[PDB]
Design a protein around this ligand. Structure first.
Ligand SMILES: Nc1ncnc2c1ncn2[C@@H]1O[C@H](COP(=O)(O)OP(=O)(O)OP(=O)(O)OP(=O)(O)OP(=O)(O)OC[C@H]2O[C@@H](n3cnc4c(N)ncnc43)[C@H](O)[C@@H]2O)[C@@H](O)[C@H]1O
Ligand SMILES: [Mg+2]
Lengths: 171, 164
């Protein structure tokens, strides 16, 4: 009884968060968290059901890379809203997403950064643009070094990267 | 709590001298050419927070984390947390954790400038709601771990968050 009660309060909070965030990240779309066994949740799993275009569910296996990423991100952020972790480390999580979607993710990071720290590795200008601080990494003679970068400098660096074939993760 | 900075010495691609890497309390972006050493900063975090899986940090064994240009006497990472919020059960505004690994694979740890054991470090991090492999750490290519996991694994994550 008592553990069930704490669980259900947490689940309903995260479930509502997830639906709201999914709709924000994918305008016109919707998604839900579903307990496989609502009577005794502890006897079943937790499923995701998404309608990327708002009507008609798209099974996870049939989702594009971008659709999978957005669904996963909505879940991470649904948890974060309920219980902000001390920090998040995201390494090129914007792969396979177009600029429109990356911007929406970046906006959600900016809002969430009021309550948690975010450290994000990215090659995407629309992800970077409103960061509080920018760290630049470069390699010379086999050795990495970091510097602090202004936005203008970081933009030039990204421009040079985007010029090369296959810059994106996964190539 | 939050990360104020990392200090890397002899760690992966970062060379033999001490490298300081500062972070905003809010949103820090890390940019740089392909292969420049960005993910290695993430690996420094995994390492100092007690990571026991060399493979997770893309090493065959833990000693492979030691800088070798083509080496260092060991690899060391220090992480500086702001603890003004007392997230860590330690009565200090700063919590500093350091891990050093030697060529033979053994690790030494420090907590606030005093030698510590691994379990001691893990327990303080757990109390503070931090772990090498939490849902909050999303390594390169792994964002869809949340959609690849079984419904059962997914519920267990919520069990954890709920505090039960
Ligand atoms: N002990 C030590 N001493 C001295 N130097 C050391 C060292 N240990 C490590 N280093 C050096 O650290 C450097 C790497 O630092 P690292 O921190 O990994 O560089 P990065 O800036 O994160 O580079 P990228 O994300 O662009 O990876 P990449 O495309 O260059 O990687 P790859 O070609 O393998 O990519 C292959 C494919 O997988 C993808 N991919 C790249 N990285 C990952 C990853 N972390 N996880 C999953 N997929 C990845 C790519 O997009 C591509 O599709 C190397 O020079 C290495 O030698
Ligand atoms: Mg990388």
């Amino acid at each position: 009884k008592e553990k069930k009660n704490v669980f259900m309060r947490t689940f309903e909070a995260i479930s509502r968060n997830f639906s709201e965030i999914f709709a924000k990240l994918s305008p016109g779309g919707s998604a839900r968290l579903i307990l496989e066994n609502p009577e005794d949740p502890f006897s079943g799993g937790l499923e995701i059901e998404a309608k990327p275009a708002g009507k008609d569910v798209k099974r996870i296996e049939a989702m594009s890379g971008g659709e999978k990423a957005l669904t996963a991100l909505a879940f991470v952020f649904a948890i974060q809203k309920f219980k902000p972790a001390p920090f998040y480390l995201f390494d090129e999580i914007d792969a396979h997403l177009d600029d429109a979607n990356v911007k929406r993710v970046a906006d959600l990071i900016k809002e969430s950064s009021k309550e948690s720290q975010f450290i994000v590795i990215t090659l995407r200008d629309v992800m970077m643009a409103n960061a509080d601080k920018i760290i630049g990494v470069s390699m010379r003679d086999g050795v990495s070094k970091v510097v602090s970068l202004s936005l203008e400098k970081a933009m030039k660096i990204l421009e040079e990267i985007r010029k090369k074939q296959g810059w994106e993760h996964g190539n | 709590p939050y990360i104020e900075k990392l200090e890397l010495k002899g760690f992966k691609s970062y060379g033999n001298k001490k490298v300081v890497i500062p972070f905003s309390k809010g949103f820090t972006a890390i940019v740089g050419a392909n292969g420049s050493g960005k993910s290695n900063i993430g690996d420094a975090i995994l390492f100092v927070l007690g990571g026991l899986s060399a493979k997770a940090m893309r090493a065959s064994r833990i000693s492979d984390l030691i800088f070798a240009g083509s080496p260092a006497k060991y690899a060391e990472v220090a992480i500086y947390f702001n603890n003004e919020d007392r997230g860590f059960p330690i009565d200090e505004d700063e919590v500093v954790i350091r891990r050093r690994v030697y060529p033979d694979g053994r690790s030494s740890y420090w907590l606030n400038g005093r030698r510590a054991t691994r379990s001691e470090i893990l327990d303080i991090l757990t109390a503070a709601m931090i772990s090498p492999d939490g849902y909050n750490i999303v390594l390169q290519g792994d964002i869809t771990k949340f959609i690849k996991m079984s419904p059962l694994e997914r519920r267990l994550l919520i069990d954890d968050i709920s505090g039960i």
